[PDB]
Amino acid sequence: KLSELFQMLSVGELSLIRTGNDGQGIRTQDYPKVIAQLNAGLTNLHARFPLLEKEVIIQQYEQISKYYLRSEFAQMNTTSTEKYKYLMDSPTERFLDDVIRVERVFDECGCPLYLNNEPCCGSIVTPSFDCIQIVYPIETNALFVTYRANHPKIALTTTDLNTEVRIPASHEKALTYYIASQLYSNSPNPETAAKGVEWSQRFEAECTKIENLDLDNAHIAQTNVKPEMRGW
């Protein structure tokens, strides 16, 4: 939970600094400063490691060819006045703007489609960082975009400490070292800047350790299918 992370930061890592309040808990006024750094740390960990991969269904409309990955066009977000909401969200999968990289794209039946392929004029291109361009949209089709997902963003004004930070206990130290590095690096004092650099190096060492141990089952080899494809 966020309370545990705040206590851990207050005593042990952010101890000899103002934000830690001498190990008596993070002040209720410095929340929008640890939370901003925490969002960056969670984004870094969720982009460098595959801690959350999710899929989103994009319903194709006859007059729309550029589909934006924004919650304003979501089926569950009822606050938006968009006439056509092509994102197909469910109470289970909500699509809270947590998109880090669009990896794979499928169709309604389940056949993979090419992504960003120029020679094949049947591929789904990506114009901008959050858009999906379908040159050939059909009113009776739906996409099945799968992406690497981010942690649901914790608002800067969040006050409830029961908001759960969903990271494995192995990356707790990596996140904490990242937060310490980011908070220690703001000041231009050489002595404090050196500590910030040391925290950055230690965070990059923890990440290297987790990569070397593959605690998230990311770098796992697959069955070779090249002989079958080449006709052996």
Partner: protein, 64 residues
């Protein structure tokens, strides 16, 4: 007979098949994948041309 026995001693007492694997090369899953016989995936700090070594019998000197 002595020279033949020396040749057989050089060819036999050696390690024909004993393959050494560096301890800090592959993680738990990749070690199993390598043992099974499929493709593996090694850490960025180790080299496959140095981590894995299969012993072969030393060549008999041409003098024998």
């Amino acid at each position: 007979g002595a020279t033949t026995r020396a040749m057989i001693d050089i060819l036999a007492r050696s390690a024909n098949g004993q393959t050494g694997i560096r301890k800090d090369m592959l993680d738990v899953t990749n070690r199993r994948k390598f043992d099974k016989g499929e493709d593996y995936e090694f850490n960025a700090n180790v080299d496959p041309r140095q981590g894995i070594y299969m012993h072969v019998s030393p060549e008999i000197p041409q003098s024998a």
